[PDB]
Design a binder for these strands. Structure first.
Ligand code: HPA
Ligand code: HPA
Lengths: 339, 339
DNA sequence: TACGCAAACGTTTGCGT
DNA sequence: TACGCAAACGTTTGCGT
């Protein structure tokens, strides 16, 4: 169970055992064999803890997420894991739930577990967080959900959420719409505010005013979707189309209309944002802006690995791009032909 | 950065530094202080690798899942993580994708990373797997998705899937139905076969024959849901109700009916199985058998921790129970009153 | 040419006194 | 009464010869 024990059966030095276990130097066949034999009977499993102590790296990665259930989230993480595996890494998944303490806790356990690098996905970034995060500038780390490039000590990957909001708005416009509504994700977030402003910009350009009774805040959870949509058509004058800050919340919105007996999109058009795996199977097939979730994983990993192996020190940042998916939840507005 | 470096600033022994860092023995205030001061400036972070080497435990847990995206799955895992965190543990998430090699790979990396215990969720359990899994009887481990209690070296937690299938079938019956259909998950699985037989039993009791054209296999993915439902009503004689082996696939089924212009449930009743967080927001609100996902996590953790701390050796097994949730996707059948 | 010896990486802990 | 010394846990590796 210990290298020595193997070395004994082998009738060889522990150095030899190491060497053949790692092809780190030439070893006589006859020798290599004996070691293996030993390694087999003794049913040895080289301790990575041992190794990690000497070589100075755990070959493990720590992802400090916000939540692992939410479809959006769930998708990215499964990608990141894909990468770790294929590249030799081990993933340590941690969810802070946007809890400062919880954050500082997980952050600390990881430093102690000595992770080669950190993948951050905290959603909101108040200074107090930006602070502890700094405190760990030593661990190589890339944040995947910043709007811009918040800190100067980590890599970023920008989703261009705004350009997505803008994309969503345009469509709606070029479809015949002028009385639109919007349910955005928590403003304390990129995917919240960012997607929204991108949208409010196409609006300004269109010369469209979004009456505030038509703007109800969500939290990326189907219920809020439900409750907001409810609050939008629960009014005397209601929009003809609505842009939903995220698909799960969209799904929330879809329900309420059905329960209010409104037809989507015959009565109301809905445009979501995320394009999660189940979206097409929404009823009706949800039209939405698709965020490259996979490349967001791989691209994050990749930058980290860089800093890791090539011991990079300067902070990078890489952009990705959302692309409009067209489905069946949007219908022509009152102004299509008048364009 | 090393205990010694702290001990120096402190003007004390590394043993003292350890002792105050762990309240493992009394230390003069004045002393305790100095250490902390040092610990602070030096910005020390005790290596858990160091520690793990001496004390013989990593205080980390390894979950060998099948997939982390699928709603069902995603839910359990987020629970398991919840537990690890609150109980001091670190989670290493691994997805084998039902790939033998991939399995044997992750299994091995974990043994090497020396995890205090293993949480298994492989879905299918062919002998070749049951074999390598055995090979690691040394690591304390509990499998969370066995039908019965397959192996004699791990703990089990039984979901009673059958009793769930049976529950699903009964309802449908007691609702007026007699021409029912079924789309079950891959038979190589508990949640597949198990849920199904439980269902086929209420049928036998009801004296109901399920014509095989009305039995189409799914894979727990919305698409199969879609394609099966499609194949069920795409026939001359179609059931009046259908039991869907799992909610995501249900969601698949819901779409197709809509696209085929059939009304759920006015034209067709659907009963799912899983009761995942979004289910209520399905359109219409999906009626289904709910599987206690959380308790499935906590209960798994808990057993493992037992074996862990209380060094248990005998294999346990604990049952959980599915409970019918009633929603809006089921309507009375032709025989309600005739009962 | 093929291998072995000892030091070492960062801790915790047994015995001290 | 409060603390320190050295051994040790499982490896990898520098120099050998
Ligand atoms: O912050 C978020 N949470 C959940 N889903 C999301 N989709 C986009 N942003 C988010
Ligand atoms: O094996 C499964 N996979 C995905 N979802 C599921 N829900 C129940 N069983 C399963």
């Amino acid at each position: 169970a210990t290298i020595k024990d193997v070395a004994k059966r082998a009738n060889v030095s522990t150095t030899t055992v190491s060497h053949v276990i790692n092809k780190t130097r030439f070893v006589a066949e006859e020798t290599r064999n004996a070691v293996w034999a030993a390694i087999k009977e003794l049913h040895y499993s080289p301790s990575a803890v041992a190794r990690s102590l000497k070589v100075n790296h755990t070959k493990s990665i720590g992802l400090l997420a916000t939540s692992s259930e939410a479809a959006y989230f769930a998708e990215i993480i499964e990608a990141v894991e894909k990468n770790c595996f294929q590249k030799g890494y081990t993933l340590i998944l941690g969810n802070a739930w946007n809890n400062l303490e919880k954050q500082r806790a997980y952050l600390s356990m990881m430093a102690q577990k000595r992770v080669d690098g950190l993948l951050v996905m905290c959603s909101e970034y108040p200074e107090p967080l930006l602070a502890m995060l700094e405190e760990y500038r030593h661990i190589p780390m890339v944040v995947m959900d910043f709007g811009e490039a918040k800190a100067d000590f980590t890599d970023a990957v920008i989703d261009n959420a705004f350009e997505g909001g803008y994309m969503a708005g345009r469509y709606l416009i070029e479809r015949g719409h002028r009385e639109i509504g919007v349910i955005p994700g928590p403003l304390e977030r990129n995917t919240g505010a960012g997607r929204l402003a991108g949208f409010m910009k196409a609006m300004e350009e269109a010369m469209i005013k979004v009456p505030e009774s038509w703007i109800v805040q969500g939290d990326f959870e189907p219920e809020s979707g439900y409750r907001a949509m409810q609050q939008i058509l629960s009014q005397p004058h209601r929009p003809t189309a609505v842009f939903c800050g995220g698909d799960i919340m969209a799904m929330g919105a879809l329900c309420a209309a059905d329960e209010m007996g409104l037809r989507v999109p015959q009565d109301v058009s809905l445009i979501g944002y995320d394009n999660v795996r189940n979206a097409r199977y929404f009823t009706p097939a949800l039209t939405t802006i698709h965020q490259p979730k996979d490349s967001l994983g791989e691209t994050a990993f990749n930058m980290l690995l860089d800093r890791i192996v090539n011991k990079r020190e300067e902070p990078q940042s890489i952009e990705v791009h959302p692309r409009l998916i067209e489905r069946r939840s949007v219908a022509d507005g009152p102004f299509r032909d008048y364009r």
